[model samples]
Target: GENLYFQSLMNNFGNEEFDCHFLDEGFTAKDILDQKINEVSSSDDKDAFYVADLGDILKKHLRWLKALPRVTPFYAVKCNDSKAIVKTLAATGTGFDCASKTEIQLVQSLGVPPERIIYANPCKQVSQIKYAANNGVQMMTFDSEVELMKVARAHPKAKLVLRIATDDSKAVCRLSVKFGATLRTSRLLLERAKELNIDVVGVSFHVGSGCTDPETFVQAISDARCVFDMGAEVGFSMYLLDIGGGFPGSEDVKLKFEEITGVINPALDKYFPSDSGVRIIAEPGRYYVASAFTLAVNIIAKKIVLEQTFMYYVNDGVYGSFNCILYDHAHVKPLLQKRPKPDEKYYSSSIWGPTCDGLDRIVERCDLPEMHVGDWMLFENMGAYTVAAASTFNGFQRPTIYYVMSGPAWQLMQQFQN
Candidate 1:
């Protein structure tokens, strides 16, 4: 097999002229493993840190949001619950879209007022709804008729949105299957709320995720308009429209919102006109911060299986950052480090995780060049749901995070130690 070498290796030899052997090293794979273990175990703290590039993620997200004529963005807190990320976006003056009491508390703890948060869950506990009302959180959603009566009992002044269930004929897991109300019942709920004098402020809908077509939003907007017209007819003038999140943000496969305006703008002006004074909002989770970071795993051990290949297990697995790969069928690419040339030829191999279980495999049956032991591998595009979804199962440590930033933010992080 061949050896992997770094582009940085050019600097290792300064003004030297020699044979191609300069690019060769006799190091076995175990030595490489020891060096990697030393590097990670030597670190004192291991909590993953959000890179300052988050400001960039927000800026780009805002540009896309603002450019859309009526669609406002309500940054979903449950997606990435990092206070640091929240503060950065808050500084940019964005509103939070929180779902739970803990999420409400997290935003509130950061001094975000209740009006700044949309308590967006369709099914909420009475205590959370009451607390949101007490704290001046004016907006929340409900799907069932029973919830409207409960809201009337707890906070008659609370403004509510009815979550319209999307047709999930193509959804892997449909929210409508559990949380949404039918158009007919939603009308009844709106009428009941009107009688109770509750402000029925808006209507919302979700197009199931991996939305292959932007036209799905077209249909959702159409469905929401139907709900809006029903509410208006019942004397509840709906003023807000929430389009739930299912936007995809993968570099390999992306959903372009360019088509969003082609359908939405015409529909809004034609049906729920801007002149109607209604606000349009969207809750985007993975689309904003997903493809921003990469993960690097240090190789620990290798075991030979057949004639030409074996398994190379790394430190982090389902216990840490790659946990989402298990929950959601995410594809992760593995990369080897730069090393000197080897004399043997390599073949197909597998990447193993540190877990002692039989199924802790990363990439199964990967064709790789001949490598001894102890080489580091990196996974690209790792920022999204991975870090937030990771666990500490079996008591193995989480992977250390590295932020590659230049300027004052980097300097400030460096100063946090002293």
Candidate 2:
């Protein structure tokens, strides 16, 4: 009841000012999280929620990039398009990688100029190409002759980048299956670009999304160098090298950023060294914000199938924020907010989402303590791809994001505001 009383007070008084008070009080993250969820749980709200430490994550990612001074990071807006995340990253000297017209507008609306944005998509609709040209977003990617003609007809002044195919067999999401030109065909594409008198500025390639292997980056960089030579033979000034996204974001991943840099740095030094004067950049979507967000889902229904078998239904599932599991080959785990009794017996339970579709199962099977309706389940490392791919399936709304920050991150955002 005491916790409920404080939660009621918090629900009524919730704002940035109140959030800062808790931060100033030296509350641990768990404590702050508990208070926020308790307010929603006590109020019997069924909406799933996200607690985003946007400023902290952005600051940490920026420092990580600074450690690799030679390579600048362009945040991929398609990863998580939360307004606060986009606005904060824009203010902190971060560039954006926009795929669609709306994404470009979102970044530019925050006063981010065209030079700081990259149209990273290879195959664009004619209208989107025209939109990019009209808005002065000159940098874009293409891998096919048809796309080159579209650019030639629609936006002849565009600065193009040639996307090469990589070994994406090991990546979680294989982009090369749909995009990227093989080395055999890339030379012809460059010839076509030269034939049309187009400005081919650089080369780009994505090893794959959620890429784990360092050797992939090494080989991709080698392949990019070969393409650069091809561009030079065709009279294009290939200065920009877009080492596209595949950086892992989940804490569960075994690879670390330093290890990634260890492999990538040596490869860059060997191929496109400092003396070569190539402007290096990367499209890092998940690395910046994945671990900084936690998702809270409400258990709306529960049923006992047998003595040791249970079925629990949550407010969010594959159709909602968990859609990444179905679409992006992600493994997301849902944990209890509070620890269970040490000696409590665990049951074999399956968690389902609040949908009529039988395919909405989030966890097929797991051992969990017996929980009741209104209890909450928490998921971490949900900042990337989850919200961006969520849908209003079965009439259930997407989760609301509650942004928070602490320590230096909060101070930095405050400075930006002033």
Candidate 3:
């Protein structure tokens, strides 16, 4: 199955070398997207579409990972789960962080080894635990004594990572509400694992998703150290530190990688020092793919509310691709494809998805040039937690994706192909 996937990707480019460049000559991504929009048939339903620069996104992310040499990125499959995203990252020899059995199967189907995969979820279905054991996936995480007993009974040989909780007040999605063990509970869990003879080999923690405080990472690592000490006290030789996830994706955001690593590098040096022999890994979903994808939605109908603000209805709504707006607390900026004239008057307009629910509003309000039906609007930084949570609500189909590679990104693919 893995070879077949690679073969299909190679065939798409007309060869094994993946040498094809799909974009038009001498155009920016926006310009190329505009050209593609102009090609849409008049009779077609222009609800929503995705223009993915998969090669560029993958290349840039790999470069960033390379720069941060101490941490190995296990690409979190839940971020976007698109085959193009997974296969490209897999070819780069990156590992995978899978939350469910299906995600593990997806990565394994692409020829990824079990050692390169981490079952990152602290809780698991009984069948999923059996699936992991049958597939040679020994490394997984647990945060409770009940979960430890489950692992001991289901897969006694499983290598466990104790998930510890951290202060998640600054994060967009605070995972500690649902997952992670408090330091007090963590010691009990480790002690129980020792009684059960379960192999507890590591400690993991997520500061939270979309984490902003660099100091939070510093503190999480510090917290992980306390657990590491407990593991040693219990006669467990803990050597792995799974710094779970919380990396940001939006390029406009203040959470820069330099800012993140500036604090993280020193923290790792201090807590799990180079001489400590601890292997470090991270589960980053959005950081690698977010800035690489652009979403375009078309205006299907419009209404003038109070003869002032305009409400434009589009093909996809909160029920579809924009689920990130509700699920991930994502704020998306809509961009106009056509350049507006300086003299063209702008209006306070809101975007809506084509759904019966009153909650389908996309942009509550924004000032933009007067747009008519058939005009298109796009959103950047959409590769994370967007399509992964999309649903075919109200019988609306998900947007089609057009994958393209150009410029230096194309060059990066060629380098990897050899």
Candidate 4:
């Protein structure tokens, strides 16, 4: 059921003070970016800001619908908790993958129905387990007998999803190291669940963050089927399969998004086909929002080092939006808002943050033309793992995000929410 607040957001899509801009023909977020840039450049306060295209988000959902038709996406709340992003996704009826009590609170505060949320965190706090029970949040993942004990005591009726480890050793999150249980332990946990009289409803696994190998998903799905049958052997009729994140967020990667789904769709059909009566869901953080956001940071100060090399300092840094570089293990390149001349000379440059800390460097050793302090540079695909991980370190503020969408996109969003 559509909640009251989400319905209000839908009917009042263009009515709120901070509502998304309804763009018409010949316009998009890039134009809005340029417009904001020109407006900010005229003022003395050239602070960093973001231009978010809700159109791109809708487009990504459409792409996902085309590629992996049967799987439902749960917007991972830990990715970017921007109110506009959350509301937009909630309006689209996309389920949420929450990792904590606060995340679940944020979603439920928006009047999102509890059924659309999955508490994907395996090891949960006892107090939070009671909170889930008190608030009617059921579907959560667990990996051990201890977790089963915690749920049995606090929320015995909870529909628990068992998380299994993956073989992909290259994942940045390295999920297997801390989160997932082995197949042996998986069986053991199910048996313990039977003894505790707790219900184990599904199986979930994340191949790894930005996994490059499709076979990793194939193997994980194959293993998940075994777990499903194992649970069935113990009198639990498991119906859900959570094929977790690792889908590419942008085309800048070595493998494309559809290419991964091409392999995934076949694997899904083989292991859990349409006739299998399985409820398939995925936890996708980066894929939906990464390309939808563009960050515009200003060049606050610069110094020509050793007559040839240059060091440029930006308003936002490691403590700000680019924290993804350290925590997300991200790689980013900047696009100067002012295009370089055909014959402009490029020189070695390093970009740093506006902090006193020595470890606040953003980009190391890139080639750029001589730039001024007031110049503007753009960073693309910054939606995921950005705002949620950033802080006002050294008192430098976070970027302001302006959400905008094309009229056609808005129309599509209006139609799809139901």
Candidate 5:
């Protein structure tokens, strides 16, 4: 009954298309579904479906962004590189955070003018640096002597932000190991930029990904202020400050907004005085859209043996929307199809994917239903990294996306539907 409800809802509201098949032509679910079109079977339609929930997702994210004061937010392009998604964001009048030549080109393709995008990648290829300047991407970042020189030669007038490596004694996913420059090295980099007449603009730093503490912002603001002051002493114009993103999203997540903003606004006031005229910007990816979409996966295969529950394969797995494991991400949650029964017992199960390598498992938990073939499961809070990270491994197509919006926003989206 639950599955029926889900299927009916999806048919009425989500995106839908028939599956494509390539015979011999080893067959795939997509392939087999295509071959069954002439038959009166339920497996015929599968391949041509994907819903881009950009409409509601973007609307909610922007509403949250508008609440913050003294800080402008820039959408990270790599988060969901969907064209319609980016276009909607651009239309909202928020700037973009692009990290590469392709990303730069992607933004430009949406007719978003150059000044509205920031070439936020500090370690840029020479061609991309020149591309940014020649194409009007004036705001960029630098953290090393080499980077400063590269931007100077490529785009001398570029507004540059110095990325400082915060001390990572306490961070969720520490970045100093790879990205930021040390404070001491940052001073030298700033000095060199001033000498070369490069328009060094501001200071930036990231506490880490999924920062769970409000105090983290306090420390980050403290660090950025130290660097901002140092850059000022070195005669580099400090007109902007970029606080990299790591905010939490799910209501069950440990970090709360009060904890985050409490530390953020006060720190801004204390360090970047109101009279300083330094505009604040944040580069957040997950906090905005992570809660907006969910994946409904169907169990196509199931088996049990040896007095222990074993394999149940789902449609999508690690190769697709679950790459956060490599980053050691926390809060990876998955829900099963079975409801709690008053009289029945539960079974442990290990879910796998349809990949040949044998490593494409969705979960290896010892607690779940003894799912039958065709049972469905759901993964939530997956709107952020997962949707944008899915790969067509094993040639399996990406899941369809469905936009969910209400009120005046729904009318606008339908009006623009093409």
Candidate 6:
């Protein structure tokens, strides 16, 4: 009854300022999902929706603190820049890793101080450099002498972190092909910065998104140590080491977050020890939010092919939340709300987006119990790069997200705010 007491207040005018719904102590995000599903099942207002458990974020941060004690997290704003997510992270005391002027503006609007933000894009536009300077976002990354010269002409007093490239052969999304500088290039960048009077503060590297090999991290950290030495030799006081994002965000990943952090702890200790007086931070995007969200799509249309195979069509698709299908190489599995009852038979099933484009196929093939139109299908771990990159292509609106937090977790978040 008390649970409903808190929920009854949800209809009040103050709800607009407080977008997140506060679940009672015993109630969870899944519980809220069931309520939402039950409500929509009887009605025709079936549109896809996401139930984001903000409490799950609190747990992820606790795990991060336990695993990587020395490193502070700079939440990458580009990952899933939902205002509620960012605000929750901000309350958790996470620094913002802004890549663009707009991102910096977003973080600043939240009242996150400039020092707590890192402008992490290596190659930036000239105007954006001035934008960073104007916003007082001095901590940024640079990989080339050209970027250094650009910074010289723009944010002359910038605290630069030279981003070195990594061997991303074992990664799902290799970023080294586009970003980061080689060790040889790092030395030249240091010397050029020395001549240009640029304040080179540190070295940074990312093994790539969906990093599988922890050895790549060890090697990258070692390479960063080498750059720190080069900077010291060049008379620069490099005190920061930014081991960039690439950590696993979902448990379905082969490498668990703690396992990666175990190797990372040893690597950071070996190079930049506890007594090294160097500040260590990471730009983690997906790690904090991937498992926190669940996407539920209504099976709007269904068809049988060849009198044997089943095809399920959902309202949101590649042009919508499932854009991760094409952009992130996501292998989203289809899970239905109606579990198979006794004697239920399963059939070959294919799932697709609602868009007219043939490329909007979400799942090429799978096995599922016969599902009907208006049934519910869910995809887990949809929090990472999915929401941020979604578009209203084909006029398909993105799913509405309902952010929920338990009373205990909300208390913890308030403590973090303190």
What's the lDDT for residue 206 in model 6?
Answer: 90
Root mean square deviation (Cα) for candidate 5 = 7.9
TM-score of each: 0.79, 0.92, 0.93, 0.95, 0.83, 0.96
Answer with 1 or 4, whichever has the higher lDDT. 4
RMSD of each: 10.5, 4.6, 3.8, 3.5, 7.9, 1.9
Write candidate 3's Cα lDDT for 87-112 as tens digits: 77787677899999999999998899
Better of 2 and 5 by TM-score: 2
Candidate models: Cα lDDT each: 0.66, 0.84, 0.84, 0.88, 0.69, 0.88
lDDT of 5 by residue, 1-418 (tens): 5445433533444333321111122323232222332232356243222323444455555455545677877888877676656666665666788989999898898788887777778799998888888898899887889897787788888888888886655567777788888878888888888899887788788777778666767777888888888887977668888888777655667676556776788888888877988888888766666765566677777787665765788777777776655443644666763465776666777877667767676676757756776556666667677757777888987776644333344344344433
Error of 1 at 407 (Å): 5.8
Model 4: ten consecutive residues of lowest lDDT? 1-10
Clashes of each: 10, 0, 0, 0, 10, 0
lDDT of 4: 0.88
Q: How do the residues 50-105 of candidate 1 rate in per-residue lDDT, one tens digit apiece?
A: 22244235445555555564777777877666555565455455578898888888
Question: Positional deviation of 313 in candidate 6, in angstroms?
Answer: 0.7
Task: Arrange candidates by TM-score, descending.
Answer: 6, 4, 3, 2, 5, 1
How well is each residue in 1-418 modelled by candidate 6, as lDDT tens digits?
A: 8556545543341256445787876787878888899987778899999999888998888888888889999999998988878878887899988889989988898789999999999989999989989888899998988898899899999999999999999888889999999989999999999999999999889999988888899999999999999999999999999988988778998898888888999889899997877999999998999999999999999999984999999988888888887777777877776667988888989898999988888888898998988888988899998989998888888888998877677667778778
Weakest lDDT window of 10 consecutive positions for candidate 6: 9-18
Please report the TM-score between candidate 2 and the true structure: 0.92
Candidate 5 is scored at a TM of 0.83
